[PDB]
Subunit: 156 residues, 3 copies
Amino acid sequence: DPAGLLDLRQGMFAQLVAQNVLLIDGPLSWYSDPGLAGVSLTGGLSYKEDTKELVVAKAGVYYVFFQMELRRVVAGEGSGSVSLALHLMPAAALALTVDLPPRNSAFGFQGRLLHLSAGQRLGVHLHTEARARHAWQLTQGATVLGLFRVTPEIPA
Amino acid sequence: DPAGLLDLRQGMFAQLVAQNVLLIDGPLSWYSDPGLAGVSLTGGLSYKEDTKELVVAKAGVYYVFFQMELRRVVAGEGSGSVSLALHLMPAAALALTVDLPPRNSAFGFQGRLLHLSAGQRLGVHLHTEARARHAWQLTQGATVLGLFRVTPEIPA
Amino acid sequence: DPAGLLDLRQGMFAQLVAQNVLLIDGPLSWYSDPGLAGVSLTGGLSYKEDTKELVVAKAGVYYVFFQMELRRVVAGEGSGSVSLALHLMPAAALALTVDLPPRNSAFGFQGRLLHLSAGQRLGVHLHTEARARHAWQLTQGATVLGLFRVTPEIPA
């Protein structure tokens, strides 16, 4: 199973940083950075090993957010939009679109409450087009997926 | 006074579990489970003693949520909706409705910020109809009322 | 630099209490009260020294809220609305309006997620009109500006 495991108790928080910098269509690759607050990814992944798939171990409602920072690396060029979408695997649960000015930075954040069943597999896909992809990149280390568990277990 | 007391400091959290399993119209009965995170109910109630009335001791804004899980216990039967509504005692402050498929589970969550005055009495009423009530039940221990205090006292 | 400094780590919280009681148009004056939860204002301000300007040291998304409590001090008089608006210095990021009955109390709360860049200067302006200003006041110590940092730094 290539996925990392997120096992959160109520009131506990985890965040994942995207390895990607190029705006390439498809699943982002995530890792846990122990220098950041929160619980680490589990299920057999090594220290800072990145994965495109995540499994949420506990059923619950989670506040889930995306943050994305972009920057224009090719002077005088690029425009369009860049989107992220969280997909339940195997419509988007949570989506974030950020517009790029033809300022040389762009930023977006979006979160929401999501119900996630035990064992729920998750992926995040990025989409943009050629004009943006050829001139802009993700700022390194600033694309983050956050999860906060709101709800409890059933009493023993 | 039959009510349990919720005395929360800023930044502190309490949750109550519903004793009910039958979908009967009227006030739900709540207790604090010490095996769950958060502050316990106070004001003279015994260990896991349930109550239909709650009094919030401190004036403030609280994030308040309901969670409800239901399950079809009579094979091949039941449909409709089930509602919860928080009432200020003695319009609903917070309401949650969940639709039941004619899957054998249903789930809902709703929260919101509420201003609650010192001493504010609270009850939660459940409503549904015969068809749902005769075939579905609350999953045991998964109906929860959560309160999180956002705001502070006046400085001394 | 007359501003107080807010230097918050991820997951950390700070709140400021307004010194003002009169409903006078213009910037409110804020101080940190160590008797309240959260991180203190920094940047050279003394113990409970109040300031009209705040600088947020770390770039991030913050949940920011205003709370305001008002009370009718002149019996049988006053009506209108009172507004607060957070301004990025040097449209309003966050705004709260509270209506005053011609009950002798009024209350409002509003919060929202805001993206704040490193070094972002902030002020809060109050507005009302003569009729309200001549009969109502801010309850002392109950006007609060809260900030909670949601997002992380870039990994080292």
